[PDB]
Amino acid sequence: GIDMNTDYTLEEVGKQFDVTRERIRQIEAKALRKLRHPSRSEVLRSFLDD
């Protein structure tokens, strides 16, 4: 739910993008892995107050 009124489910997103649900899942997992890769999001890691 980023920069929009509401979020969209994975199936509606796949339908809008003409991409299967599993391919959408794999692309999301690749994006999450790339964000978990180091040398990035250092301020995001610093955003924890514990």
Annotated binding site: 42, 45
Q: Which is nearer to DNA, 18 or 42 (CB)?
A: 18
Q: Which of 17, 39, 38 is nearest to 28 (CA)?
A: 17
- Reading the block at residue 36, the tokens are 């978990």
Among 21, 30, 35, 41, binds DNA (CB under 7 A): 21
Q: Which is nearer to DNA, 5 or 9 (CB)?
A: 9
Residues 35 and 28 sit within 8 Å (Cβ to Cβ) = no
Q: Is residue 40 classed as helix, strand or coil in its secondary structure? A: coil
Q: Is 11 near DNA (CB under 7 A)?
A: yes
Residues found near DNA in the complex (CB under 7 A):
9-11, 21-22, 25-26
